[PDB]
Paper text:
Variant [name] was further analyzed and showed higher affinity for [name] as an scFv compared with 602 scFv, largely due to a 3.6-fold reduction in dissociation rate. Interestingly, while 602 and [name] occlude an almost identical interface on the cytokine, they exhibit a subtle offset in binding angle. Whereas the T101S mutation in CDR3H and the F225S mutation in CDR3L introduced for [name] did not appear to alter cytokine/antibody interactions, the G227D mutation in CDR3L created a new salt bridge with residue R38 of [name], consistent with the observed improvement in [name] binding. The epitopes on [name] engaged by 602 and [name] are similar, and although [name] occupies less interface on the γC-adjacent portion of [name] compared with 602, overlap with the IL-2Rα subunit epitope is identical for the 2 antibodies. Furthermore, 602- and [name]-bound [name] were essentially superimposable with receptor-bound [name], recapitulating the 15° shift that the C helix of [name] undergoes upon receptor binding. As was previously observed for the S4B6 antibody, the 602 and [name] antibodies allosterically prime [name] for engagement of IL-2Rβ and γC by enforcing this C helix shift, which is similarly induced by IL-2Rα binding. In addition, whereas structural alignments of mIL-2–bound S4B6 suggest that it may sterically clash with hIL-2Rβ, 602 and the [name] variant do not show any steric clashes with IL-2Rβ due to the shift in binding topology away from the IL-2Rβ subunit relative to S4B6. Importantly, in contrast with previous efforts in generating [name] muteins, the structural advantages for [name] IC were realized without modifying the [name] sequence, thus improving bias toward Effs without increasing potential immunogenicity or compromising the native activity of [name].
[name] is a multifunctional cytokine produced primarily by T cells and coordinating numerous essential activities in immune cells. Disrupting interaction between [name] and IL-2Rα eliminates the competitive advantage for IL-2Rα–expressing cells, enabling more potent stimulation of pro-inflammatory Effs.
Residue numbers in the entry:
A (entry chain C): 2 to 114, 135 to 240
B (entry chain A): 6 to 73, 82 to 98, 103 to 133
The structure:
């Protein structure tokens, strides 16, 4: 399974942004594809989704300048965004939106010059061996459609937990998710140095598939 | 009793077809919105204990039906609880409400066709 974003690099506001997501190892006839972006010093925000069967849903803040299309025969998804401004500078990711979301590498685009999810705390200064709890409270029931992500600077988010409680293979036993309806918790036991990172939750029950604001964990 | 078991499966099969036929053969101005929601799907569903995977999705199912149901879901809940007697394993692909209902209708027909 691979998703590979190909974008322009630098674009002027006179032009439209066009990014191609080329996928391998699965079919676009079997999965929804979301587009996410992350501004340079900021958290993650969901832009839109193209459904397995063809239609789309866009974030209300972008629905007038965004276009997501796809070609099932070529395993490619296309994002087009117009009326560009400097704050559209971001890393753009395409995401396979299965039960355990599978993310692309992300491509940086530089522009030339609703269920709310409350994540707490925003920052945690802590020590090795400590156990930390991060909470992700949704404004409505989300029926366990809650994923936890770990992000180190310079890298894409890594999926830790999906479906509120399912530990992804390859992620240490020290991580666990819990919760039921509106309130979800990530617990890290025996804090280790390789856990220093920013953590984000994302709900995927109803669009827009909103993220929590992030929790920066420093030792 | 393999007899009582199949009247419950026949009952569970009918309840699911009632929901499917109520969103398929019906005006439904909220169909496009209803279709956006994604249901978790069983990695395997061949034994009655796999109905655990259906039970856990009854709460999202009721929520989606409400956008257009408590009685039907509660009736289904009782039958599932009677029939199932484990740890549900989910596939990665998620499904629309129609694909979800079709999978569990198919499941009942498989099981009904193995005790008669």
């Amino acid at each position: 399974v691979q998703l590979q974003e190909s974008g322009p690099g630098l674009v002027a506001p006179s032009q439209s942004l066009s990014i191609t997501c080329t996928v391998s190892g699965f079919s676009l006839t079997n999965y929804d594809i979301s587009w996410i972006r992350q501004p340079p010093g900021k958290g993650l925000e969901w832009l839109g989704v193209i459904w397995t069967g063809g239609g789309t849903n866009y974030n209300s803040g972008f629905m007038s300048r965004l276009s997501i299309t796809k070609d099932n025969s070529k395993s490619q998804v296309f994002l087009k965004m117009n009326s560009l401004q400097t704050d559209d500078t971001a890393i753009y990711y395409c995401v396979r939106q299965g039960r355990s979301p599978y993310w692309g590498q992300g491509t940086l685009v530089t522009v030339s010059a609703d269920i709310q999810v409350t994540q707490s705390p925003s920052s945690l200064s802590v020590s090795l061996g400590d156990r930390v709890t991060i909470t992700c409270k949704a404004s409505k029931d989300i029926y366990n459609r809650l994923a936890w992500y770990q992000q180190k600077p310079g890298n894409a988010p890594r999926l830790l937990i999906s479906g509120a409680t399912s530990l992804e293979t390859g992620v240490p036993s020290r991580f666990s998710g819990s919760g039921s309806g509106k309130d979800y918790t990530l617990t890290i036991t025996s804090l280790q140095t390789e856990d220093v990172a920013t953590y984000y939750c994302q709900q995927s029950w109803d669009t827009p598939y909103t993220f929590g604001g992030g929790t920066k964990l420093e030792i | 009793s393999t007899k009582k078991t199949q009247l419950q499966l026949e009952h569970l099969l009918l309840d699911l077809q009632m929901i499917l036929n109520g969103i398929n053969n019906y005006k439904n101005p909220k169909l496009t919105r209803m279709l956006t929601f994604k249901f978790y799907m069983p990695k395997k569903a061949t034994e009655l204990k796999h109905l655990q995977c259906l039970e856990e999705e009854l709460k999202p199912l009721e929520e989606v039906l409400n956008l257009a149901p408590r009685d039907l879901i509660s009736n289904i809940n009782v039958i599932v609880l009677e029939l199932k007697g484990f740890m549900c394993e989910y596939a990665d692909e998620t499904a629309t409400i129609v694909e979800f209902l079709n999978r569990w209708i198919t499941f009942c027909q498989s099981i009904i066709s193995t005790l008669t």
